[PDB]
Design an enzyme around this catalytic site. Structure first.
Site, PDB file in Angstrom:
ATOM      1  CG  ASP A  10      18.722  58.890 -53.223  1.00 57.56           C
ATOM      2  OD1 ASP A  10      17.926  59.087 -54.159  1.00 57.56           O
ATOM      3  OD2 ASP A  10      19.179  60.010 -52.607  1.00 57.56           O
ATOM      4  CG  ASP A  26      21.747  64.303 -54.647  1.00 57.99           C
ATOM      5  OD1 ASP A  26      22.459  64.347 -55.458  1.00 57.99           O
ATOM      6  OD2 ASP A  26      21.571  64.998 -53.675  1.00 57.99           O
ATOM      7  CB  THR A  72      17.308  58.550 -57.712  1.00 57.48           C
ATOM      8  OG1 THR A  72      17.878  59.817 -57.012  1.00 57.48           O
ATOM      9  CG2 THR A  72      17.385  58.505 -59.158  1.00 57.48           C
ATOM     10  CG  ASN A  73      12.215  61.656 -54.995  1.00 57.64           C
ATOM     11  OD1 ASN A  73      11.685  60.894 -55.440  1.00 57.64           O
ATOM     12  ND2 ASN A  73      12.047  62.391 -53.684  1.00 57.64           N
ATOM     13  CG  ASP A  87      21.064  61.979 -49.494  1.00 60.92           C
ATOM     14  OD1 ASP A  87      20.628  61.270 -50.402  1.00 60.92           O
ATOM     15  OD2 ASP A  87      20.722  63.208 -49.223  1.00 60.92           O
ATOM     16  CG  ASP A 101      52.249  40.107 -78.925  1.00 62.19           C
ATOM     17  OD1 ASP A 101      52.899  40.351 -79.795  1.00 62.19           O
ATOM     18  OD2 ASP A 101      51.635  39.532 -78.022  1.00 62.19           O
ATOM     19  CE1 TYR A 147      57.651  34.249 -79.753  1.00 62.50           C
ATOM     20  CE2 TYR A 147      59.799  34.283 -79.099  1.00 62.50           C
ATOM     21  CZ  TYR A 147      58.729  34.994 -79.569  1.00 62.50           C
ATOM     22  OH  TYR A 147      58.879  36.395 -79.487  1.00 62.50           O
ATOM     23  CE1 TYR A 193      55.939  35.443 -83.692  1.00 60.67           C
ATOM     24  CE2 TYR A 193      53.630  34.598 -84.167  1.00 60.67           C
ATOM     25  CZ  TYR A 193      54.390  35.291 -83.110  1.00 60.67           C
ATOM     26  OH  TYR A 193      54.175  35.639 -82.136  1.00 60.67           O
ATOM     27  CG  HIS A 242      53.754  39.364 -74.132  1.00 59.48           C
ATOM     28  ND1 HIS A 242      54.280  40.437 -74.573  1.00 59.48           N
ATOM     29  CD2 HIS A 242      53.144  38.605 -74.967  1.00 59.48           C
ATOM     30  CE1 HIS A 242      53.649  40.576 -75.864  1.00 59.48           C
ATOM     31  NE2 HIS A 242      52.988  39.433 -76.274  1.00 59.48           N
TER      32      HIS A 242
HETATM   33  O1  LIG Z   1      55.824  36.955 -80.226  1.00 62.17           O
HETATM   34  C1  LIG Z   1      55.369  37.983 -79.802  1.00 62.17           C
HETATM   35  N1  LIG Z   1      55.447  39.210 -80.222  1.00 62.17           N
HETATM   36  C2  LIG Z   1      56.061  39.968 -81.207  1.00 62.17           C
HETATM   37  C3  LIG Z   1      56.907  39.020 -82.179  1.00 62.17           C
HETATM   38  C4  LIG Z   1      57.628  39.844 -83.181  1.00 62.17           C
HETATM   39  C5  LIG Z   1      57.526  41.101 -83.282  1.00 62.17           C
HETATM   40  I1  LIG Z   1      58.708  42.231 -85.101  1.00 62.17           I
HETATM   41  C6  LIG Z   1      56.992  41.787 -82.430  1.00 62.17           C
HETATM   42  C7  LIG Z   1      56.278  41.222 -81.417  1.00 62.17           C
HETATM   43  N2  LIG Z   1      54.712  37.411 -78.532  1.00 62.17           N
HETATM   44  C8  LIG Z   1      54.559  36.384 -77.698  1.00 62.17           C
HETATM   45  C9  LIG Z   1      55.378  36.542 -76.453  1.00 62.17           C
HETATM   46  C10 LIG Z   1      55.150  35.193 -75.442  1.00 62.17           C
HETATM   47  C11 LIG Z   1      53.736  34.587 -75.511  1.00 62.17           C
HETATM   48  C12 LIG Z   1      52.841  34.428 -76.700  1.00 62.17           C
HETATM   49  C13 LIG Z   1      53.161  35.785 -77.654  1.00 62.17           C
END
Ligand SMILES: O=C(Nc1ccc(I)cc1)NC1CCCCC1
Ligand SMILES: O=C(Nc1ccc(I)cc1)NC1CCCCC1
Lengths: 490, 541
Positions: B6, B8, B120-121, B182, B330, B378, B462, B520
């Site tokens: 229900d 209510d 429900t009503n 209820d 990010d 990376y 990047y 992250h």
């Molecule tokens: O590389 C980034 N973020 C990032 C890079 C450069 C800048 I200026 C702002 C955020 N993130 C990664 C963190 C680890 C897993 C994959 C994504």
């Protein structure tokens, strides 16, 4: 050529050290409390419409339009004032050349060469105009057509009318279109999706079109409503355009259409909207109001009145009587009018869409006798002064996807619809309502709404003189006004 | 199986009833005089035309006021002259909210596989706080497969009519279905057909006990409503010629753009989306240029920050919005802050997740600075076109489970060792354990969503290292004033909290958010928190 104007006070007004270069963009507003009182001066300045219109003209005409003004960055509070005013001009110019961005202010020769570079054209074939003139020194130098603006136009329109050619005095609202628009796509039932368009920020108002149209219709109220201060959601009615348009008939039951209309809000996560239907949609729009009042904050019908069903009068019978409701009967037979309308859409639309002072309309009532809703209609319809060739082409393209089955399927649920509405017989409509009537609507004439307040107390009224069934497309500037004034007021 | 509730007394509360009782308080009125309209067993009259949905509720004011005036002094008891029931119901309703725990238990068996519904009503409400009613109905909307409202079909509880219609609607047996109300005088009919009664007496739990049993056991503090993913609006703005931006929309205004990071999708905010909608905002969770359903070209300049931000604006323009709340995480947060720095008008407020506002030193080549942070390797690895594409792409199944892992998860990425081994998933097993922070489908989506784009474009973010620096080297004289929030994740390996300590030099008033035990993958990892903060933020400033 190209045409350019400045904003400082030529496309907006009333017009207007660390100040001299924050223009260049090295500093914001707030961070500049040296050498304050105007965080409103800018507020109290809106668009210079006759001027803003001059633009859309020229752009429609073949130029490329721009803004090359001395700006700055408002972290202000009357900041949005700017955003919107800008978000507005936005779509109508192709290039935004602002001092606070390209680092170079007016009048340093930079921006000019920069401008010309940006588009790539000669000093000559590009006109410019500033409320300042002390800024037109350079442009006249290089060799460009300068224009002042010491009033609020004048030679502006006038001397600038020289350009190629002129513009009017009582303009239509601005169009809007048709891919410079967001294209939302909610999916309610499994095979059923609803396409629509979105413009402006909240609250929401769904613009439901009628037969045989598309969301494209509100193309004049859409911008306006957005600006009005609402988030428009001009939908493609089930069966039309880009939304799913099956073949099944029960599929277009009113009971159904309205229910889904709700699942739409749910999915999109909105708990209430302002439903504003016209034509066959207005029917739904009112039923909306009658069956789901929560989800409706307000309702507006265009031409369509609230026409309840008499429990002791077969609905069909009542259709057979109104002389003008013939075409409507003609329709009832599946594949038939499909076959008629479809054959050559080019004719189909210009025939349907004509004004209140236009010959060659439709065959509302002889439709069964003549055996065809177009037989007294020319074979080469003249373009209604109320549409353009492209305006038509869109409708076509938009219809080639759906064919006509589905849009027509709205008629064909005659009995059931009656069967269903025969419950809102005990109820009354209380949520804000508006009935706007069109003086010369051949079927759906004003007269048919005289009883409404028996059902809808407080029903507010709207009346447009010299109207056809094609209200929005025919008397828009008006429709807007009313529509807005309505939303503003209640 | 199935269990419906229900609305209510069990799903929505505190009940409308109680209100009646304590007016049967505010006035002489003897036990049940006023409630009796609603609560009876044998229902009749003005409310009976309501529940059945013959007349709206406003109609029902004139009629039921004057219906009570009958049984007033006329027939035992003293009922006031200048009297009413209107805003002592249109108040008690606007004052009833969702029974958090119930809904939770409701979603449970949906996940577990029942058909959930609510019988429900109801009644149609053309009332003022009629809205209050929609939202609540709006929300529950999804979690139940069925909606049998008295005011719609035409039967009312406990008239046998309804039950039998519900059954015929699912198409079950009085047994394989459970019910709770209820009322109990409502329950009578179903413990007669043969269904599992549950007097939802309390605020629940008492309920969720001799109920837990039946079906299973319910988590203590479940996972927040995660919008999910088929039945959500799919907007599609087109900014530049070849460039379109896909996104998702939920809830009504004002607007806040949820910009995701690398290597994700809009799907990420899948937990804050609903929440933010409910919060009271129109969410626009976008697919970042290059990702998912938005255009993702090959060109590099294409992903310049200068660019991304500019388009980000054309987005608002096109969609006709003059201002929004940008909330990046990010690589997006970077943009989100630049957003704030370059277009302050269009930004009402900004929030970054993990990402700090990292201005560029005019006298320090940007590249050089990347070569130094040990962990930013990376990042360098990436700089070379086609390379990491080739690595990540080869088997996305691994790629994602490797990337998305928690703060207590082995097998992460090779932030800094990268180049040497010539890879980021080189040491990451080539068969990854499913991170306890995602599901197999959660992954499959990311995959599918990525098969369309490949990895070029997302990585292209990047690769505009120098220019980005070149451009931002102008917001060097400026300061950020529009409301801001920096929410930091305690255990974020790269983008650690420490890197944001100077921010207020740039962003005075910068408000702060800090989540302990974080990866992250903030939203996906500590959502319930993120939500809280995020909302509390928007609420407050
Ligand atoms: O590389 C980034 N973020 C990032 C890079 C450069 C800048 I200026 C702002 C955020 N993130 C990664 C963190 C680890 C897993 C994959 C994504
Ligand atoms: O048929 C309708 N409208 C209508 C029909 C039935 C109802 I109930 C409500 C509106 N419109 C026509 C008017 C003439 C040109 C083509 C469309």
């Amino acid at each position: 050529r190209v045409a350019a104007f400045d904003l400082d006070g030529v496309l907006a007004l009333p017009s207007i050290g660390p100040t001299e270069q924050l223009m260049k963009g090295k500093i914001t507003f707030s961070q500049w409390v040296p050498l304050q009182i105007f965080s409103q001066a800018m507020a109290a300045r809106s668009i210079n419409r006759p001027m803003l219109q001059a633009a859309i003209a020229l752009k429609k005409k073949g130029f490329t339009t721009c803004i090359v003004t001395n700006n700055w960055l408002d972290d202000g509070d009357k900041r949005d004032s700017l955003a919107q005013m800008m978000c507005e001009l936005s779509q109508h110019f192709d290039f935004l050349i602002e001092s606070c961005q390209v680092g170079m202010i007016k009048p340093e020769p930079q921006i000019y060469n920069f401008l010309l570079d940006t588009l790539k054209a000669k000093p000559n074939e590009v006109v410019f105009l500033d409320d300042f003139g002390s800024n037109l020194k350079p442009a006249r130098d290089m060799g460009m057509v300068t224009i002042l603006v010491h009033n609020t136009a004048s030679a502006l329109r006038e001397l600038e009318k020289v350009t190629g050619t002129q513009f009017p005095e009582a303009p239509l609202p601005v169009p809007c279109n048709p891919n410079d628009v967001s294209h939302g796509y909610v999916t309610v039932k499994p095979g059923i999706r609803l396409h629509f368009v979105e413009m402006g920020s909240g609250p929401a108002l769904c613009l439901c079109h009628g037969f045989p149209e598309s969301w494209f219709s509100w193309r004049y109220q859409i911008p306006a409503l957005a600006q009005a201060g609402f988030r428009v959601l001009a939908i493609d009615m089930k069966g039309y355009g880009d939304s799913s348009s099956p073949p099944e008939i029960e599929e277009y039951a009113m009971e159904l259409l309205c229910k889904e209309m709700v699942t739409f809000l749910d999915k999109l996560g909105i708990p209430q909207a302002v439903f504003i239907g016209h034509d066959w949609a207005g029917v739904m729009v009112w039923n909306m109001a009658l069956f789901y009042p929560e989800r409706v904050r307000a309702v507006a019908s265009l031409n369509t009145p609230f026409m309840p069903p008499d429990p002791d009068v077969s609905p069909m019978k009542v259709i057979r009587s109104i002389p003008v409701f013939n075409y409507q009967l003609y329709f009832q037979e599946p594949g038939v009018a499909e076959a008629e309308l479809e054959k050559n859409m080019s004719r189909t639309f210009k025939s349907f869409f004509r004004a209140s002072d236009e010959t060659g309309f439709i065959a509302v009532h002889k439709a069964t006798e003549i055996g065809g809703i177009l037989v007294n209609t020319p074979e080469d319809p003249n373009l209604s002064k109320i549409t353009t060739e492209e305006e038509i082409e869109f409708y076509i393209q938009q219809f080639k996807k759906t064919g006509f089955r589905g849009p027509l399927n709205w008629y064909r649920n005659t009995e059931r619809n009656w069967k269903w509405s025969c419950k809102g017989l005990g109820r009354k409509i209380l949520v804000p309502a508006l009935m706007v009537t069109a003086e010369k609507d051949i079927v759906l004439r004003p007269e048919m709404s005289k009883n409404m307040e028996k059902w809808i107390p407080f029903l507010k009224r709207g009346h447009i003189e010299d109207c056809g069934h094609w209200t929005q497309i025919e008397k828009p500037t008006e429709v807007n006004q009313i529509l807005i004034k309505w939303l503003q007021t209640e």
